Paper text:
Recombinant human [name] is typically produced in E. coli by refolding from three separate polypeptides expressed in inclusion bodies, which correspond to the native α, β and γ chains.
To facilitate recombinant human [name] production, we designed a single-chain construct ([name]-c) by connecting α, β and γ by flexible linkers, based on atomic coordinates taken from the crystal structure of human [name]/[name]/DNA complex. Similarly, a second linker (L2) with sequence SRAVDGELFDT was introduced connecting the α chain with the β chain giving rise to a single-chain [name]-c construct γ-L1-α-L2-βencompassing 240 amino acid residues in total. [name]-c could be produced in high amounts in soluble form in E. coli and purified to homogeneity without any need for refolding steps (see Materials and methods section). We improved the crystals manually and determined the 2.4 Å crystal structure of [name]-c. The crystal structure revealed a virtually identical conformation of unliganded [name]-c as compared to [name] in the [name]/[name]/DNA complex. [name]-c was active in a band-shift assay with [name] and adenovirus major late promoter (AdMLP) TATA-DNA similar to purified [name] using the classical refolding protocol. Residues 2–210 could be modeled unambiguously in the electron density maps.
Numbering used by the authors: 2 to 210
The structure:
């Protein structure tokens, strides 16, 4: 399970929650590390198995770079379409992990509240490492409540001092280029576009250098 969804509104509110409990001595930094690892699994599996929407996007390719099997792209003048909303953004950064070998598993039911299902899975799946480290249900519920509270705060109108960076964090099936014409097949994506979260199962894109 890839670590790159840790830098998302869901992944950050969890890291901040974990930081507060370390700081208050309620959990060890090493238990925190285990939780993030379980989070990686829940969000990878949740995107692969519960999310179905398609997205199409167009933009101009400004910057491109491949490193350790992760593409990073910057595009200007982007348009992202669904069935059938449209979002424009002057600038977007796409970070994509190699999803060739993943290919996750079976596809379960869609859910009304994807983040809500991920929080439940994680809390259920770290209950036992908590118990084993001497930490009881009340601390586990303190993690759940901090996580959920920080998640709400991300929606606050005056929650940021400045514009938020437009970023897609996802996987790729295939990236190609024929001359100046790039094509993107991306999957299992969380986008933060003008302050707001959007998810995707599959995203297909075009860009010109």
């Amino acid at each position: 399970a890839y670590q790159l969804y840790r830098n998302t509104t869901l992944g950050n509110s969890l890291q901040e929650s974990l930081d507060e409990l370390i700081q208050s001595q309620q959990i060890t930094p090493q238990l925190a590390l285990q939780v993030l690892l379980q989070f990686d699994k829940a969000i990878n599996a949740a995107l692969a198995q519960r999310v179905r929407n398609r997205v199409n996007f167009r933009g101009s390719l400004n910057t491109y770079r491949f490193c350790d099997n992760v593409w990073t792209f910057v595009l200007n003048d982007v348009e992202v379409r669904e069935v059938t909303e449209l979002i424009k953004v002057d600038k977007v950064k796409i970070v994509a992990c190699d999803g060739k070998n993943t290919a996750n598993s079976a596809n379960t039911n869609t859910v009304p509240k994807l983040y809500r299902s991920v929080i439940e899975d994680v809390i259920n799946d770290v209950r036992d490492i908590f118990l084993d480290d001497g930490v009881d249900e009340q601390v586990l519920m303190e993690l759940k409540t901090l996580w959920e509270n920080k998640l709400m705060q991300s929606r606050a109108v005056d929650g940021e001092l400045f514009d938020t960076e437009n970023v897609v964090v996802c996987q790729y099936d295939k990236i190609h280029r024929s001359k100046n014409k790039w094509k993107f097949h991306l999957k299992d994506g969380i986008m933060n576009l003008n302050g707001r979260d959007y998810i995707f199962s599959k995203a297909i894109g075009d860009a010109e250098w």
